[PDB]
């Protein structure tokens, strides 16, 4: 049988955290900071997808080009298969074509 | 795994409670039970 017997430990979500109470501050530093910066230059993450939504195949062409020279050795070879698989899948398979 | 089914036990006992008066392995085993509690209804 698969279901756990005693209740789990109760979760203590500190709702008035530092991260949580001040979430979304300095959003709209464009529209009322007179257009010095951009909200897309506030996003912290991977350099290839900083303010760019993309699709699963586009998320790999951009990674293979923006950081693709400086990637790890057998991690790059993995990505070149993945582009070759998602190209073969998006342009030859599916319904609705 | 994001999103495993945590309450699978309770979809099983919704079925087996109407099969508990059967005889054989259908009063315990869900694979055999749902072919017979559906035919009972």
């Amino acid at each position: 049988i698969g279901i756990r017997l005693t209740l789990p430990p109760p979760k203590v979500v500190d709702r008035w955290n530092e991260k949580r109470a001040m979430f979304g501050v300095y959003d709209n530093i464009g529209i009322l900071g007179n257009f010095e910066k951009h909200p897309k230059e506030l996003i912290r993450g991977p350099i290839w997808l900083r303010g760019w939504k993309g699709n699963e195949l586009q998320r790999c062409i951009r990674k293979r080009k923006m950081v693709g020279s400086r990637m790890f050795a057998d991690d790059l070879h993995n990505l070149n298969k993945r582009i070759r698989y998602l190209y073969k899948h998006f342009n030859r398979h599916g319904k609705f074509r | 795994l994001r999103n495993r089914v945590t309450d699978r036990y309770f979809r099983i006992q919704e079925v087996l409670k109407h099969a508990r008066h059967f005889r054989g392995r259908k009063n315990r085993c869900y694979r055999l039970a749902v072919r017979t509690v559906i035919r009972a209804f």
């Binding site: 698969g2 279901i3 017997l5 209740l7 | 495993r4 945590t6 309450d7 036990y9 309770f10």
Partner: peptide
């Protein structure tokens, strides 16, 4: 271990429905 809490909470309402039948209250 699954991340559920409502599975495990609603299970021990079916352990108290199964405990008051076998060891019934006065």
């Amino acid at each position: 271990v699954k991340k559920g809490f409502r599975a495990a909470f609603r299970f021990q309402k079916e352990l108290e429905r199964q405990r008051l039948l076998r060891c019934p209250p006065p």
